[PDB]
């Protein structure tokens, strides 16, 4: 879910933490139902992408001597 600052930037309106909580609760309730394509697009309008960086260690290349 987008943070309160992102929602304020989208709406061009000052918001409160409780207003953001109500909006996010309503969006989650929207997701929980048998939503259609348009109802999913509306949600994806607010959903943001998070880069899940893998904690897997980088493997050094295998070099060869003389």
């Amino acid at each position: 879910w987008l943070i309160k600052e992102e929602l304020e930037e989208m709406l061009v309106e000052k918001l409160s933490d409780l207003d953001y909580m109500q909006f996010i609760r309503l969006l989650e309730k929207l997701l929980t139902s048998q939503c259609g394509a348009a109802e999913e697009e509306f949600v994806q309008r607010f959903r943001r992408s998070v880069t899940l960086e893998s904690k897997k260690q980088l493997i050094e290349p295998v070099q060869y001597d003389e």
Binding site: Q22, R25, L26, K29
Partner: protein, 85 residues
Amino acid sequence: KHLKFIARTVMVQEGNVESAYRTLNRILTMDGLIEDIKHRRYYEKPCRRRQRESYERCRRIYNMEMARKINFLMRKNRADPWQGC
């Protein structure tokens, strides 16, 4: 002058002395004997006794009314039907 082992007596069930004593204490508490003994340890002057009785009666009235209101409104603790509006 009365017979014995009739008043304030509770029979123990299968050696469950803990539950028997709990039942005896509950009986004494509900009948008010415990509070009576505690208040009779030291003499309570009649003005102090009247003040305590007035305070306890007002407390009983307030507590009963608050409990009635809580029970009356408890049905309204259900989920919000108009969420988002």
